[PDB]
Amino acid sequence: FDSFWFVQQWPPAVCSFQKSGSCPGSGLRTFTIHGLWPQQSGTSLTNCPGSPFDITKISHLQSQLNTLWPNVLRANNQQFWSHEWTKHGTCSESTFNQAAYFKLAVDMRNNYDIIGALRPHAAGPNGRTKSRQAIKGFLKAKFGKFPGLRCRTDPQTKVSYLVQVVACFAQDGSTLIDCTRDTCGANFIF
Numbered sequence: 001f002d003s004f005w006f007v008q009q010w011p012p013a014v015c016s017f018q019k020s021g022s023c024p025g026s027g028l029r030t031f032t033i034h035g036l037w038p039q040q041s042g043t044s045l046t047n048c049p050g051s052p053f054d055i056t057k058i059s060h061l062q063s064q065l066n067t068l069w070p071n072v073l074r075a076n077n078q079q080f081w082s083h084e085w086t087k088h089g090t091c092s093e094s095t096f097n098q099a100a101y102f103k104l105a106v107d108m109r110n111n112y113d114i115i116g117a118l119r120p121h122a123a124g125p126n127g128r129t130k131s132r133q134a135i136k137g138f139l140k141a142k143f144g145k146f147p148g149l150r151c152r153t154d155p156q157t158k159v160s161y162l163v164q165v166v167a168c169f170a171q172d173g174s175t176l177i178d179c180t181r182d183t184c185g186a187n188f189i190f
């Protein structure tokens with residue numbers, strides 16, 4: 001791998017697309033971790049053969065993980081962590097063992113407070129239209145590099161909503177670099 005995509009999701013928006021059934025994310029008001037995805041030549045590396053998920057290796061992080069990395073779609077946090085490890089984490093296991101991988105995601109979340117970086121500039125979430133350039137600009141000013149913005153379009157109204165924010169890191173997992181791909185248009189609701 002040559003870099004990482006640290007992906008955070010906005011729970012209310014994610015769950016807004018679940019028009020049927022329960023969705024725990026509907027009641028959260030902060031960005032939470034979706035995943036830490038190793039990258040290679042502009043694409044995500046997935047399903048690499050590696051070690052099976054072992055909860056005992058991250059037992060010391062259970063408090064932080066239940067708070068910062070909850071499953072927002074269903075009430076089963078461990079299943080989500082196991083899925084993320086098997087699908088993404090194994091691809092960077094040559095340098096980051098399971099414990100280090102989850103610790104890395106936690107440290108990244110604690111050091112990349114999106115709402116805190118937007119609130120002062122009147123760019124916090126309020127269900128109104130935001131500019132892609134403005135949001136990327138505020139985050140670049142605070143963190144030093146451009147983030148990636150990901151959006152989803154509502155099937156009924158065709159309105160675009162911000163659902164995830166990506167912070168791009170070099171292969172060392174600590175050096176921030178500019179992201180280069182957005183799925184958001186010029187404007188979206190946030």
Ligand SMILES: O=c1ccn([C@@H]2O[C@H](CO)[C@@H](O)[C@H]2OP(=O)(O)O)c(=O)[nH]1
Binds near residue numbers: 070071072074
């Ligand atoms: O909080 C969350 C956010 C996303 N997911 C993803 O959706 C699929 C549900 O079975 C899960 O497989 C997982 O897929 P991922 O996008 O890699 O594919 C959750 O389960 N919980």
